[PDB]
Amino acid sequence: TRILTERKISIPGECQVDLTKKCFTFTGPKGKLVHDCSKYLMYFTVEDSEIVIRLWHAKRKQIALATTVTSLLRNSITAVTKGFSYVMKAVHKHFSINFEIKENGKVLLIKNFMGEKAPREFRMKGQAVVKMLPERKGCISIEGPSLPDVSQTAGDITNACRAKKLDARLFLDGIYVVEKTTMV
Amino acid sequence: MHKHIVVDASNHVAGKLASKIAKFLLEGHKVTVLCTERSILTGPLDRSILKFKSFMNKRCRVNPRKGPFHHVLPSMRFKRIIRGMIPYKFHKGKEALKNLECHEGIPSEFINSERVMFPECLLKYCNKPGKKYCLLGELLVKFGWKHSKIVKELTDSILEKEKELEKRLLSLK
């Protein structure tokens, strides 16, 4: 338990940040985000183009939270400058899979998964969209301004499209994430 | 000497505020409570559900009509807390309960009347800082309170809008 802990975060010039009491507002070219920081028991001071977070007389369970809330707010800076992109490619054996997109990238429709008649629907989270890729012919890319909406949606397709009641070490049919890069 | 007092119940612990009121009634005053859906209950949300679920199990087996009743509204739930402090069976406690009134949010009559707070019951000055808690009306939505949305809108608009001498001294002497 040290006396003084400190963390610094350097912002770029194109991403503008202004804060009221215990609330953040990020405005840049590729979108907008707002963040609530009132729940934590810490101090927030915006200096000249840098965010400083200080914390006095903490124990070991409170020291570890200072790094986590730093990296969470660090991701929201780059997310408004550069969007994210997650590429998920479907692998199949003896059957084929068709991808249908409805209402401008808000609904993904999956058909003929292992030869079943009932199609599956998936909604998208807040501030995200899905597009096809005609080049690689077997994958799609989820692109959005914010990271936790994108990374939650890709995890939803992987868990819901697995096969149950059968031997999973033999069948090997699903949708799997290939790469995670930024939009630019 | 007996006074009439309007109390804002927000930012208060639920059990500790009801302790100080029950002595204030037994000396013969009159008191009214506003915004009882914003009191605080300490602890996680997960224990506070388990406590209320055990209260919903007690019912009379022979005739369930003549059994323990479970009120849902945050006004009528706050009245059951204050009744545990007062000897409500004798004549001494029957009189003190006739001077108590609680309400949901802020009604129309009390927009201009002042309010008070208790410094022995506020959360910033009662406990240690940095532990988890929950509200009262947040808990009662899961048990079947039909209307928690309209009360939030009407009260917040109310809480937004409020945020020749020397001659007479010589003549009268």
Partner: protein, 234 residues
């Protein structure tokens, strides 16, 4: 000790306790949801039960069939509109705002409101002014969310019933706009509407009524309990 063999219980606990109803025309507890896109239309009616016969019909499945079904007949004369209410939303719940009646009210409603000596009480009373009703309709249009009308029946056209008191009811109006709903209902004062306007063929309904009476009954006809053996006393 435990019970030897398993068996379900006799009777339903959803209807305990069993009491006689307080009125002969029960109110409606629920009404369907309104959509602001669709047209303005009523939701209810009042009728009288007549009898029962049977018809036959066809169904193809290829070859046809002959099915024999039993139908029932309800005799429905027209109904007249004579009032408009309004309800608002509060913190506690729905609360009434105002009530506006028409000018000339039939004596059938006067028989319903005032039982005996209805000629004495109705002659003494008097109506509202122009200025009273112009304030109430304004306070309906600004504060209401649910608008309902008042409908009374016409039992004097069926002389078998020996009835001159007319039953009254409340019927919700599901339509486009709240201000548009009041202007529709003010037009229809003292004007009738038939059964053909609301329901068409192939539309499922709900029926609200009162059952037949059977008096003081035993245990077997009330619940369904198995009798005792023949040898038993008492």
């Amino acid at each position: 000790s435990c019970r030897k063999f398993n068996a379900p219980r006799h009777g339903s606990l959803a209807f305990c306790p069993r009491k006689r109803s307080k009125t002969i025309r029960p109110p409606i507890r629920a009404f369907p949801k309104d959509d602001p896109s669709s047209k303005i239309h009523l939701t209810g009616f009042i009728g009288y039960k007549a009898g029962m016969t049977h018809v036959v019909r066809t169904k193809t499945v290829q070859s046809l069939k002959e099915i024999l079904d039993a139908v029932t007949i309800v005799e429905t004369p027209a109904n007249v509109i004579y009032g408009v209410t309004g309800y608002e939303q509060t913190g506690r719940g729905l609360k009434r705002v105002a009530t506006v009646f028409s000018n000339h009210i039939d004596q059938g409603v006067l028989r319903r409101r005032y039982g005996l000596k209805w000629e004495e009480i109705s002659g003494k009373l008097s109506g509202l002014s122009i200025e009273d009703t112009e304030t109430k309709i304004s306070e309906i249009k600004k504060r209401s969310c649910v608008i309902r009308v008042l409908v009374h029946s016409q039992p004097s056209k069926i002389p078998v019933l020996n009835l001159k008191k007319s039953h009254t009811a409340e019927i919700q109006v599901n339509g486009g706009s709240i201000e548009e709903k009041v202007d529709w209902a003010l037009e229809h004062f003292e004007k009738e509407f038939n059964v053909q306007d609301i329901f068409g063929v192939d539309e499922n309904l709900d029926v609200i009524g009162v059952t037949k009476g059977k008096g003081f009954t035993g245990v077997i006809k009330r619940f369904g309990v198995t009798k005792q053996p023949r040898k038993s006393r008492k």
